């Protein structure tokens, strides 16, 4: 559909477009310049250092962010196979209320809810047989 626009502009010689902003460097620059209204960050990024600094940067710049599952999902959002990040910067008047409500919902459900728990270490899980052996040892030590 881009070619449909270029032919139309050639005949005249177009309104202001609204689109999802994507690209890691572009989105990081938008966050640093405080232009991004909302940021979505994919959780399954390898190497992870590409996005491991994004929540702290968004928190420092006061940009609402949400970690979502699926770089493939963000890629379908931006017409790619994968996308590490997506950003909403400018929205239409028919969707400004929806965007504000979504920002409030993310603030209630993701930022405030996971504020404490994200400061803790993860991966404290044993294997199945090790857990069974530890449970048996604890039961035997507590009661004969």
């Amino acid at each position: 559909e881009k070619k449909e626009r270029l032919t139309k502009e050639a005949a005249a010689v177009s309104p202001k477009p609204y689109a999802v902003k994507y690209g890691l460097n572009h989105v990081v620059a938008l966050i640093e310049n405080k232009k991004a209204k909302l940021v979505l960050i994919a959780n399954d990024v390898d190497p992870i250092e590409l996005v491991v600094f994004l929540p702290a940067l968004c928190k420092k710049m006061g940009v609402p962010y949400a970690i979502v599952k699926g770089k493939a999902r963000l890629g379908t959002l931006v017409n790619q196979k994968t996308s590490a990040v997506a950003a909403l910067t400018e929205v239409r008047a028919e969707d400004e209320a929806a965007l504000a409500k979504l920002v409030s919902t993310i603030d209630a459900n993701f930022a405030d809810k996971y504020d404490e728990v994200k400061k803790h270490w993860g991966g404290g899980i044993l294997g199945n047989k090790a857990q069974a052996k530890m449970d048996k040892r604890a039961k035997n030590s507590d009661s004969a």
């Binding site: 890691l24 460097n25 990081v28 620059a29 190497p47 992870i48 250092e49 590409l50 491991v52 600094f53 940067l57």
Partner: protein, 189 residues
Amino acid sequence: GAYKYLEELQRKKQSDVLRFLQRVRVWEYRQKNVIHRAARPTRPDKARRLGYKAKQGFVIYRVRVRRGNRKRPVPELKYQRSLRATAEERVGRRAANLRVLNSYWVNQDSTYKYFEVILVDPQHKAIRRDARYNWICDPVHKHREARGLTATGKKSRGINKGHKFNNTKAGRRKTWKRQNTLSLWRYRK
């Protein structure tokens, strides 16, 4: 851009996050083969700093090399080239159809050091038509790592300016031959 953050974080190597990452990645690399193709650079900022571009014709190969001293085959000696150069030469012999551009450290343990090598395809039309990268298609650049023309090769050869590099300024054996030659003219001076 995220590359500045990547550079600073990669410098901060003793942090908990980077220690955890290097541990899990060194286990994965030990699971894989000694030399194997890498789907993408593990350090994209470092790769593009060294000259990698994300387009058709650029290849990443991950290689492990054994650490320690050289062993003289006799039934405390030091190799004059680096383990990075050894890794580059082995990867070049593997992918003889390509040209080695550069390489970088990724990980190590007590037994192995781990490097990623960037290679360029001189037959790919994107490279052949790219004016910034078609210099490597010239036949004078065959096996640069084998002749010591990469960054680690020139560092090992001691190719630098100054009084500290008089013996190895432009060729150690070249300047030895130049100095140890008797020069006689037609009218003897």
